[PDB]
Amino acid sequence: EYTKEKKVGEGTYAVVYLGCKIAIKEIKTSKDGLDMSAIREVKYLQEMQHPNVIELIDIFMAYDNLNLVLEFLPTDLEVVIKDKSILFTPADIKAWMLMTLRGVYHCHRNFILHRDLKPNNLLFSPDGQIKVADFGLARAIPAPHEILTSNVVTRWYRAPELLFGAKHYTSAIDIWSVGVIFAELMLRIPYLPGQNDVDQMEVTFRALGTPTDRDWPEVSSFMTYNKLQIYPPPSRDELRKRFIAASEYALDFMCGMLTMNPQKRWTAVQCLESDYFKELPPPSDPSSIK
Amino acid sequence: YRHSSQYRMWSYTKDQLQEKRVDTNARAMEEELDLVNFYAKKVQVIAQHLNLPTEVVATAISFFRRFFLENSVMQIDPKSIVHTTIFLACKSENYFISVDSFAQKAKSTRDSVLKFEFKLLESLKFSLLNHHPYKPLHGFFLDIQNVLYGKVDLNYMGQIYDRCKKRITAALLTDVVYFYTPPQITLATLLIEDEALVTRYLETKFSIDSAKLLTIIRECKSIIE
Amino acid sequence: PFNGDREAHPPFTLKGSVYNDPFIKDLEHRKEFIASGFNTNYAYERVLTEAFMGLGCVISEE
Numbered sequence: 001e002y003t004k005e006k007k008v009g010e011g012t013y014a015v016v017y018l019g020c021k022i023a024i025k026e027i028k029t030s031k032d033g034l035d036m037s038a039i040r041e042v043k044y045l046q047e048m049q050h051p052n053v054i055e056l057i058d059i060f061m062a063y064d065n066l067n068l069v070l071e072f073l074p075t076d077l078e079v080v081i082k083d084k085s086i087l088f089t090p091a092d093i094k095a096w097m098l099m100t101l102r103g104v105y106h107c108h109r110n111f112i113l114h115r116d117l118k119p120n121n122l123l124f125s126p127d128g129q130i131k132v133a134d135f136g137l138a139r140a141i142p143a144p145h146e147i148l149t150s151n152v153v154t155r156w157y158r159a160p161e162l163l164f165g166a167k168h169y170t171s172a173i174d175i176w177s178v179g180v181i182f183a184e185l186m187l188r189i190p191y192l193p194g195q196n197d198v199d200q201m202e203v204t205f206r207a208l209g210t211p212t213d214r215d216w217p218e219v220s221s222f223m224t225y226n227k228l229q230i231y232p233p234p235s236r237d238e239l240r241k242r243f244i245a246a247s248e249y250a251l252d253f254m255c256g257m258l259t260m261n262p263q264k265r266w267t268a269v270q271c272l273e274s275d276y277f278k279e280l281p282p283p284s285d286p287s288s289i290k
Numbered sequence: 291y292r293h294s295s296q297y298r299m300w301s302y303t304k305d306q307l308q309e310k311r312v313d314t315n316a317r318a319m320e321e322e323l324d325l326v327n328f329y330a331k332k333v334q335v336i337a338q339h340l341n342l343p344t345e346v347v348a349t350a351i352s353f354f355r356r357f358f359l360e361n362s363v364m365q366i367d368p369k370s371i372v373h374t375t376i377f378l379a380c381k382s383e384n385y386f387i388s389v390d391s392f393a394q395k396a397k398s399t400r401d402s403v404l405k406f407e408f409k410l411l412e413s414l415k416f417s418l419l420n421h422h423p424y425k426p427l428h429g430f431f432l433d434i435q436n437v438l439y440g441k442v443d444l445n446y447m448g449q450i451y452d453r454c455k456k457r458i459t460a461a462l463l464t465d466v467v468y469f470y471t472p473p474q475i476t477l478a479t480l481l482i483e484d485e486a487l488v489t490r491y492l493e494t495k496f497s498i499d500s501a502k503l504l505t506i507i508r509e510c511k512s513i514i515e
Numbered sequence: 516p517f518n519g520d521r522e523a524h525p526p527f528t529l530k531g532s533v534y535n536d537p538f539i540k541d542l543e544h545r546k547e548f549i550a551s552g553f554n555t556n557y558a559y560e561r562v563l564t565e566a567f568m569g570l571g572c573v574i575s576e577e
């Protein structure tokens with residue numbers, strides 16, 4: 001729509017506007033004419049309609065730039081980092097996980113990757129339904145002989161095959177990210193931080209374990225597994241210590257979601273029915289979020 | 291499929307598509323259609339000339355034809371669109387050619403591939419992902435063998451993957467993708483060998499009735515002939 | 516009751532131990548292809564469900 005008000009965003013790639021209930025995202029056109037991450041982010045967000053992925057009302061052309069629409073309210077990152085412990089493990093940890101996995105499964109059954117998943121990518125709504133957006137490095141799931149990119153997702157939310165250097169991966173790299181969203185939501189801390197380097201591999205090995213030959217096979221075919229040594233995987237003494245605010249069935253699909261095996265990683269069709277939402281209490285979308 | 295961009299705003303019927311032709315010839319009359327088919331053949335052979343996959347050739351043909359459904363060939367000349375559509379097709383589904391590497395492999399000097407780019411996306415109205423019959427070829431390459439075991443995979447890997455692919459490139463040169471869904475175009479072009487393949491496939495498959503689908507595939511064959 | 520996904524289930528069948536595809540079954544025998552999480556049934560489930568998307572008509576266009 002042709003309505004504008006005050007701006008959000010200090011980034012030089014895009015500065016988003018606001019107006020009407022909507023938010024106009026403008027890509028500055030002024031090398032190449034149009035960037036990869038403008039057509040790459042309109043061409044899959046145009047064709048999805050869901051209550052967990054935002055949609056386009058109009059994509060009307062500007063004089064030089066490209067206009068989109070977005071959502072009004074802020075994101076999941078400002079919810080976690082600044083509160084007075086409103087969020088409670090009976091109900092608030094279940095509904096947002098259920099809706100984010102619903103959005104991830106709607107991306108997956110359209111065979112679209114969406115390899116940029118962050119709490120500043122997951123954003124809420126006035127009725128509190130969390131949305132999946134910002135498809136800036138998304139890609140359709142191609143033919144198996146096609147070579148993909150490498151560094152496609154951010155550091156703190158990176159799948160370990162992307163740490164190791166998997167050039168042509170599957171779409172199981174975005175279940176690891178939402179499992180880290182689960183742990184970041186029930187721990188209220190930035191989970192697995194790195195020092196702007198290759199140190200994400202060492203902190204992931206320190207947290208969840210250096211993969212062994214017997215279990216996730218062919219991990220030594222990356223020219224990175226020989227650089228380091230083995231670390232012990234965590235046992236079920238993690239149930240009380242460092243994860244004491246959790247239920248019995250939460251650790252089952254958390255450990256099934258933080259599998260470092262990508263072939264044995266639980267896809268969303270077996271994460272939406274992983275008997276964790278069946279346990280009491282039932283969730284409800286009125287949550288005390290400002 | 292109804293949530294996809296190809297169904298909700300660029301899938302047509304015969305009366306709606308002929309109405310689209312006469313309104314883009316009325317807002318801007320029979321030489322335009324075989325002119326854009328000739329230049330579609332030109333962009334097909336120059337896209338196949340510069341060593342591209344069959345997926346990006348199909349998207350380039352569809353982008354060129356979808357550009358010239360909304361604009362005529364006189365107020366935008368078709369001799370300059372034919373180098374821009376390969377660029378937006380290869381930048382669409384990640385081919386990854388650069389601009390200068392694309393210009394040195396073509397007859398372009400970096401300006402002739404970028405000026406007709408904003409208006410091509412405006413007249414295209416940003417339906418930049420397209421569904422193509424090659425993944426239904428790889429699906430019905432496998433679903434024949436699952437339901438049938440009598441006469442399989444000798445001639446069907448001998449002379450089907452090298453023939454039906456070229457027949458669907460010739461189909462994308464014609465006007466069939468605005469009519470039917472790409473599995474229906476796939477099963478139409480599989481009816482070249484209808485001695486024992488397609489009739490024995492659709493009879494034993496059976497929520498979806500069979501005879502309506504045979505009539506849809508038969509009238510699609512009447513369109514393509 | 517409740518549903519985890521509101522409407523997200525197709526009713527068609529699949530059997531991945533039958534086919535003899537010369538583009539993926541030979542591709543999965545390599546070393547670096549397995550190491551990125553690739554198996555045969557994921558690609559076949561990707562392509563066979565795409566082969567059945569949209570079996571409608573032209574009557575459903577107005």
Ligand SMILES: Nc1ncnc2c1ncn2[C@@H]1O[C@H](COP(=O)(O)OP(=O)(O)O)[C@@H](O)[C@H]1O
Binds near residue numbers: 072123
């Ligand atoms: N719908 C929105 N409502 C409010 N703020 C938004 C909205 N969308 C984006 N923003 C802001 O735009 C910026 C996102 O731009 P970008 O850097 O491209 O995302 P990313 O870091 O995932 O790559 C963020 O600062 C975000 O706060």
